[PDB]
Amino acid sequence: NRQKTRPRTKISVEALGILQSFIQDVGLYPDEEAIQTLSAQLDLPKYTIIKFFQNQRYYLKHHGKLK
Fold this sequence. Notes:
DNA-binding region: 5-64
Helix content: 55-70%
Number of helices: 3
Number of strands: 0
CATH superfamily: Homeodomain-like
Organism: Homo sapiens
Protein name: DNA-binding protein SATB1
Family: Belongs to the CUT homeobox family.
CATH architecture: Orthogonal Bundle
Subcellular location: Nucleus matrix; Nucleus, PML body
């Protein structure tokens, strides 16, 4: 008797905030140790990190405008 909310999916809010900052600080080129640490810290799988950075890597390439 209640359907007005759905569980969070595709990286949590806390994970996105830290992940986004990682790119602004470090960049779009993580390492094996970076994923192992981030995956354990953010509590997210390994593939989730590769897809995240990999996807964003095209965002800057394709789209030619920031902000």
